[PDB]
Design a protein around this nucleic acid. Structure first.
Lengths: 237, 621, 647
RNA sequence: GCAAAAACA
């Protein structure tokens, strides 16, 4: 198969060009995963104006679906670098994907929009009210998942073959089958790191310090930025 | 230590990583024992087959994913912390290679897997004999013997026995030499055990006094502080131009302008007007960047450091001494109050054009109504126009200094009124600006239209007479340098609107909470200490003056300003406590005003705030 | 200033947020740090005795002093040993659940700590290249140096790394190995001791600039161990400034006639009056009463003993002027105000047994202060974060309260904490105070930010920049620093800045290209009207536009296609989530990047968990590739052909 | 000239 041959050739390339790096311990990956020579920029927001206005601001993977010159405008430097208007061109004359892929990509984000518009708002009440902050679950999840079992739930969805019995045991079943069904169109070699990110946010029960007038359910915690304040309270039905 | 003779290499470099031997009490002996177990596992398997496939699977020290694959076949499942070392296809069972002291005291460890026991001199449990072949048992004999000789020769019998009995024990060891290095700069051992009885001594302390009256800040004496900001501030004016582009407005100004020097400053010689005229002419022609003229040397300080160094080298005398720096002490200038009263004057336009956010709920409508009303009340003010000028000038200067040029860039400051007309506040000229770090200074030559000239207020500005059509305008040139950080910061000057907006919103929402009804038309009466007396002013003009103060503080921010504010927060808290009939007490040697007075040196707005504090009551009843 | 102080309808506490310089530039520290570093070093040596005597204080190893030596009318450096022992014992006895959690962390979680977490630290001075290097590079070079000098592979755990450091410290000779960097025990010891100093940038609220020190990578493992233990304790004690606590004390109704006061203050020269030996004693008492083994004690005591031998770098030199000339000269070359410390100069570093540096032990210093709090007379609620504290007194008599406040000052002085008299203010009736940038008035604690939100895109790409800008504004609203009007105004300012930064305003090349090609603006970064409201700060841009009909299915499939050439941050992948943009370090970096790239494809699970999987990268990749080929449900001949090429 | 305990030019 093409995928296996591509993986083998890249593996032999790594052994040849980087022998010493391949002789390191596999646990060292947690260290050189972030091995960057470039120094941390304390003010990255301060270079954006110049970076956007440089010639060829965007770095792109080589492809043929983007013309070299489009209506007198050179789009690519012919890795290769793209013009700032390349994403604008792709929004009109780009290659389309399946609707299932779009639905999976917008999952865990379309849900937040539906929750906002599927709830009715009571009248705003103004008064002397004291917002006291407690740690609560910020975002609603498809299934209630114990922390420190989130990674084990993710393993079953994505790579159930590369796991142990105990990791299998300490994984939320019921959330695996919901995650597998909705993430199926995007569980591939590409967008694997993306699909994990949506998978995490769908069952992530992280706690954040949010203003409270009454105890927040997970539904109302993601909207606490406007439900309550020092002078107003909004009632949600 | 090194690899034992009986243990071959492959097992040694396989066991190098399997466990953290160095952190174990007997890690070397433990590693040797596990290598024995793996060697026994390999000898049991050897070259044997069942149905064309190898009879045994050596799960020990094997990739866990491979183990899980093999267990997915054959329909078995083994936990990772109790994984058997071997699996037999002949009997469809799994075995664990174990070493014991005696074969009499042996019991099945668990029902998941069967046990293979050896007592370290070669012989095996009867179950092993019933399971293993004669050749395999002979090989295990011939390994355990000639491993026992290595055990005895190095005298590790007790260590081996301890390793067999219990599991791994964690440890951390510090030897003699590192211990001596550690003990060099301390009076105690590695584990401090001082020979003193624990006790908390009774120590006599000083007395806590009361701050009966509020501190009086020190007003410095000296020459009044000149205006030392990037741009003009309240004295800023613009020339109304016919509608068009920036190039059209610049051409209109340059074609019908006559410039004559009124007041000349030694800091900014009148000869630098040629640079501004050349920049105007070039920009009118469509070229915002022009070549270098002779006056550009003086205007932008080209090759100034390499002349000052030779001047200092020529003027060398005396002996070296530690460089004591000094900051000139300056008094509150009269122009700060004038700036404040002029910054609040009304304007015809709004000067604050921010795109509205979306509105979906009633909360969004309330928030946008609050923002709209705040923009209404602080928009048609001169301070808003000055903020717009500062924003545009700083943004355009910042956007043109990343190129690292050797030529002069022109960045006109032009606004549009809601009728199409162009408003020319002035132009900023950027020099070569070979900028390396973000704190490096870019040379600038700033030209601004000046409402009124004051030599005392603007000693380093050269003021010129500018005439367009029939109107008269004042043009000021100043030679200045200004860093990348500060230009970027002032390009975001619109963030100064937040704090006055915060105060306004808090007042409005407090009224709404009091009456349980939002009313955006509230303009209540705010009582304040004014000219040393308690009168009141409306909310709108109070917010206007707050915005004027915040803008002046922002454009005059420096270490003195921040130290002064951080140390006046405590005194502001103390004053508010004394309003509520609360008492304030201080420790021995407590002079809170000293922290503030250390920061009042020559900052005009620090001095203005200090005088505002001093005019306030210092005692409350 | 009178304009900032209302007398009706609003109180000065709320308007005290106006005493800030949010919009103005932060001060910059220019030039040499040598004078500041030397002053920080010399302050402890002047405060050891009531009458200053630097020469007699320069031969003190352990900063132990008699109670009569403690200066109550001025700053005092050092500690009283019996005081430290008794205070640490009292702290251990009272906060017993916290120490049980410490014991659990030591037994269970301490051995599982991985030294790869050192790679997440900040910039580190390299003892091999003699330059400041990023933490991953320093960690990699240190581990390779250890493996070269120890003839073994360092285990993934932090304890293995610390044991490797201890073992390599015992060699007469160490090398690095084509250039060969040759060390000695004394030279490696000096590199281990050395603290690299630098200016503390972007610091607000101070007239004078400060310096901070960085430890060497050889000691950062021990430092991380002790700081993690300190954090474990501090997360479980009510006197630490970590959760809330200020709000809880503010809302705590005491009595109806009790004399209740509130003390707010900072600590003067907090890091210049602290001695590491006091923290050694406190930690040793804690571990000894916990029943920990001796190796735990040795592990906890190594960091502070190395700090007692610190060799803080004294900057670039002292500034000297002949006439108009300026020169940069080291300490000791010519007379200065630091001539007492000339005998402590070691190369370009200076040795100093007393005192500490900011940014080195933030949590252990807080623990020392909190054990100083633990007395029988101090029956008051204390909360402290490093050099900032707030104390609440619930007494029955004003003289009793005053004696308790004096006892607090003296017991802080017992270990060398020395709160600033001019910055500490006690309000006789409790209800007004300030602590850690939170301003308290009656039943209200107002969080006031030290820094206003940037309201500018972060500079990564439009979708992420919009997401993080909205998240920052929402967090500011949640902390109470912003409200409805302030939040919406910040959103509008951020929207304008965001559109400007991405060529979405006026006439630019991007807008011209979109107009000529009839590409209508559909996203905010493209110049379209903003879709986000105040209530929708938490919603993604791509969503909330499909829902409202502003984005149709065609352009959704076109921009969300994963095959686009260009591709918490809860922003969906899109064509607009793009990327804009030392001799033997760049090639090593690209080799490591390739080795990372082959992983995350053969190992999907490293995206979820840590690497684990004992063994080296070569054979781990080898066997995983063999397994994925073997379980590819292909023909046997093709599988054998594929595996024949895997070498 | 910018700046503020010393850098930029």
């Amino acid at each position: 198969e093409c995928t296996l041959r591509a993986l083998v050739e890249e593996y032999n390339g790594a052994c040849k060009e980087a022998p010493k790096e391949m002789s390191k311990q596999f646990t060292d990956y947690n260290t050189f995963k972030r091995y960057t020579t470039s120094k941390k920029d304390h003010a990255p927001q301060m270079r954006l104006v110049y970076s956007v206005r440089k010639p060829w601001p965007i770095s792109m993977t080589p492809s043929k679906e983007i013309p070299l010159v489009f209506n007198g405008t050179k789009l690519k430097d012919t890795r290769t670098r793209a013009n700032i208007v390349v994403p604008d061109y792709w929004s009109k004359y780009g290659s389309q994907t399946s609707l299932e892929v779009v639905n999976a990509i917008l999952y865990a984000e379309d849900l937040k929009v539906q929750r906002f518009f599927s709830t009715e708002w009571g009248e705003i009440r103004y008064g002397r009210m004291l917002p006291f902050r407690k740690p609560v679950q910020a975002c609603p999840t498809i299934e209630e998942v114990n922390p420190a079992s989130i990674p084990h739930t993710l393993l079953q969805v994505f790579c159930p073959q590369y796991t142990t019995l105990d990791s299998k045991r300490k994984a939320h079943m019921g959330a695996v089958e919901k995650l597998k069904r909705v993430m199926e169109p995007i569980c591939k070699v590409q967008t694997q790191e993306s699909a994990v990110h949506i998978a995490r946010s769908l069952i992530d029960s992280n706690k954040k310090w949010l203003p409270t007038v009454v105890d927040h359910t997970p539904r109302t915690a993601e909207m606490a930025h406007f439900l309550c304040s020092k002078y107003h309270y909004v009632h949600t039905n | 230590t090194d690899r034992p003779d009986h243990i071959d290499s492959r097992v040694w470099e396989l066991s190098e990583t399997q466990e953290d031997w160095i952190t174990q009490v007997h890690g070397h002996v433990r590693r040797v024992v596990e290598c024995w177990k793996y060697t026994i596992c390999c000898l049991i398997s050897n070259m044997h087959t069942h149905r064309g496939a190898p009879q045994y699977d050596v799960f020990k020290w094997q990739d866990r994913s491979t183990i899980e694959w093999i267990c997915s076949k054959k329909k078995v499942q083994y936990p990772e912390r109790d994984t058997p070392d071997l699996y037999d296809n002949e009997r469809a069972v799994a075995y664990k290679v174990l070493l014991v002291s005696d074969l009499s005291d042996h019991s099945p460890t668990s029902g998941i897997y069967h046990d293979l026991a050896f007592n370290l001199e070669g012989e095996a449990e009867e179950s092993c004999a019933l399971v293993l072949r004669g050749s395999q048992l002979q090989d295990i004999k011939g390994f355990l013997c000639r491993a026992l000789e290595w055990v005895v020769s190095n005298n590790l019998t007790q260590e081996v026995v301890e390793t067999i009995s219990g599991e791994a024990k964690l440890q951390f060891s510090v030897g003699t030499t590192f211990r001596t290095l550690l003990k060099r700069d301390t009076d105690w051992d590695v584990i401090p055990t001082p020979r003193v009885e624990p006790n908390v001594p009774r120590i006599e302390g000083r007395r806590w006094t009361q701050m009966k009256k509020l501190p009086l800040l020190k007003e410095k004496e000296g020459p009044p502080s000149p205006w030392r900001a990037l741009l003009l501030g309240a004295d800023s004016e613009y020339i109304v131009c016919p509608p068009g582009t920036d190039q059209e407005a610049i051409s209109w100004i340059h074609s019908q302008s006559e410039i004559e020097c009124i007041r000349e400053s030694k800091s900014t010689p009148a000869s630098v007007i040629t640079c501004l005229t050349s920049s105007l002419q070039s920009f009118a022609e469509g070229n915002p960047v022009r070549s270098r003229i002779h006056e550009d040397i003086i205007a932008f300080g080209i090759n100034k450091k390499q002349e000052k160094k030779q001047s200092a080298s020529s003027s060398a005398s005396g002996e070296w001494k530690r460089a004591e720096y000094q900051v000139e002490e300056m008094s509150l200038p009269p122009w700060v109050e004038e700036e404040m009263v002029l910054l609040r004057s009304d304007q015809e336009d709004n000067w604050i054009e921010l795109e509205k956010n979306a509105i979906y709920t009633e909360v969004d409508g309330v928030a946008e109504g609050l923002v709209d009303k705040y923009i209404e009340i602080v928009g048609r003010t001169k301070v808003a126009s000055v903020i717009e000028k500062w924003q545009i000038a700083a943004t355009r200067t910042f956007s043109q200094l990343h190129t690292d040029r050797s030529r002069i860039t022109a960045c006109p400051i032009i606004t549009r009124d809601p009728s199409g007309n162009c408003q020319f506040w002035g132009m900023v000229l950027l020099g070569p600006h070979h900028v390396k770090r973000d704190t490096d200074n870019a040379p600038l030559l700033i030209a601004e239209i000046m409402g009124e000239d004051t030599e005392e207020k603007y000693p380093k500005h050269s003021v010129f007479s500018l005439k367009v059509e029939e109107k008269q305008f004042l043009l000021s040139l100043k030679i200045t340098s200004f860093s990348r950080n500060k230009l970027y910061t002032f390009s975001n000057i619109r963030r100064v609107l937040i704090q006055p907006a915060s105060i306004y919103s808090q007042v409005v929402l407090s009224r709404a909470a009091e009456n349980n009804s939002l009313n955006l038309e509230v303009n209540p009466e705010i009582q304040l200490y004014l000219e040393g007396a308690q009168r009141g002013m409306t909310l709108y003009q109070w917010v206007r003056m707050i915005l004027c103060l915040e803008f002046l503080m922002a454009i005059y921010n420096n270490p003195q300003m921040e130290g002064f504010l951080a140390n006046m927060r405590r005194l502001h808290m103390s004053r508010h406590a004394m309003m509520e009939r609360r008492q304030v007490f201080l420790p021995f040697g407590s002079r809170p005003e000293d922290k503030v007075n250390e920061c009042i040196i020559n900052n005009p707005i620090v001095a203005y705030l200090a005088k505002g504090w001093n005019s306030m009551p210092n005692v409350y009843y | 200033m009178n304009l900032f102080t209302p007398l009706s309808e609003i109180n000065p506490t709320t308007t005290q947020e106006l005493l800030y310089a949010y919009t103005g530039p932060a001060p910059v520290a220019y030039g040499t740090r040598t004078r500041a570093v030397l002053e920080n070093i010399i302050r402890p040596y002047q405060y050891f005795y009531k009458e200053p005597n630097v020469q007699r204080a320069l031969d003190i190893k352990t900063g132990c002093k008699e109670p009569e030596d403690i200066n109550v009318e001025g700053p005092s450096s050092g500690f009283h040993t019996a005081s430290v022992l008794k205070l640490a014992d009292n702290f251990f006895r009272k906060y017993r659940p916290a120490m049980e959690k410490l014991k659990y962390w030591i037994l269970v979680k301490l051995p599982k700590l991985k030294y790869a977490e050192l790679s997440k630290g900040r910039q580190t001075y390299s003892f091999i290249h003699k330059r400041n290097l990023p933490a991953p590079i320093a960690l990699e070079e240190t581990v390779e140096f250890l493996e070269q000098n120890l003839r073994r592979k360092i285990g993934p755990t932090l304890l293995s790394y610390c044991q490797a450091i201890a073992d390599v410290m015992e060699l007469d000779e160490t090398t690095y190995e084509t250039y060969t960097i040759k060390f000695s025990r004394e030279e490696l010891w000096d590199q281990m001791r050395t603290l690299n100093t630098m200016w503390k940038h972007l610091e607000r609220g101070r007239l004078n600039r400060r310096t901070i020190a960085t430890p060497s990578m050889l000691i950062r493992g021990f430092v991380k161990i002790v700081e993690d233990a300190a954090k474990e304790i501090l997360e479980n004690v009510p006197t630490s400034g970590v959760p809330e606590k200020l709000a809880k004390l503010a809302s705590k109704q005491t009595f109806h006639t009790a004399v209740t006061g509130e003390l707010s203050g900072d600590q003067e020269k907090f890091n210049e009056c602290l001695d590491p030996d006091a923290m050694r004693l406190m930690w040793t008492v804690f571990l000894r009463k916990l029943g920990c083994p001796d190796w735990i004690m040795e592990l906890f005591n190594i960091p502070f003993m190395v700090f007692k031998s610190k060799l803080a770098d004294m900057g670039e030199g002292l500034v000297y002027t002949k006439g108009k000339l300026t020169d940069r000269k080291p300490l000791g070359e010519m007379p200065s105000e630091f001539d007492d410390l000339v005998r402590n100069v070691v190369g370009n570093s200076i040795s100093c047994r007393l005192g500490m540096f900011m940014g080195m032990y933030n949590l252990t210093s807080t623990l020392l202060a909190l054990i100083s709090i633990e007395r029988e007379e101090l029956t008051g609620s204390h909360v402290e974060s490093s050099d900032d504290f707030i104390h609440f007194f619930n007494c029955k008599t004003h003289e009793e309260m005053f004696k308790q406040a004096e006892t607090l000052r003296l017991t802080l002085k017992l270990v060398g904490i020395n709160m600033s008299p001019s910055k500490c203010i006690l309000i006789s009736p409790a209800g007004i105070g300030e602590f850690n940038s939170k301003f308290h008035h009656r039943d209200f604690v107002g969080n006031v930010a030290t820094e206003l939100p940037a309201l500018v895109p972060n500079g990564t790409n439009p979708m992420t920049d919009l997401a993080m800008g909205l998240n920052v504004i929402k967090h500011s609203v949640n902390t109470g620093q912003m409200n409805l009007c302030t939040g919406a105004l910040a959103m509008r300012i951020f929207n304008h800045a965001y559109k400007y930064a991405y060529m979405a305003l006026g006439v630019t090349r991007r807008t011209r290209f979109m107009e000529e090609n009839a590409i209508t603006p559909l996203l905010t970064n493209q110049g379209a009207s903003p879709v986000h409201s105040f209530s929708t700060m938490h919603l993604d841009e791509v969503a909330l536009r499909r829902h409202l009909g502003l984005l149709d299915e065609e352009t959704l499939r076109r921009i969300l296609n994963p095959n686009n050439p260009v591709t918490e941050d809860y922003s969906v992948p899109s064509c607009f989530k793009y990327t804009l943009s030392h001799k033997a370090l760049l090639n090593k970096e690209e080799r490591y990047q390739r080795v990372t790239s082959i992983i995350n494809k053969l190992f999907p699970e490293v995206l979820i968990q840590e690497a684990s999987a004992p063994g080296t990268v070569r054979e781990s990749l080898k066997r995983r590739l063999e397994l994925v080929v073997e379980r590819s449900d292909l023909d046997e001949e093709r599988k054998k052909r594929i595996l024949s090429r895997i070498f």
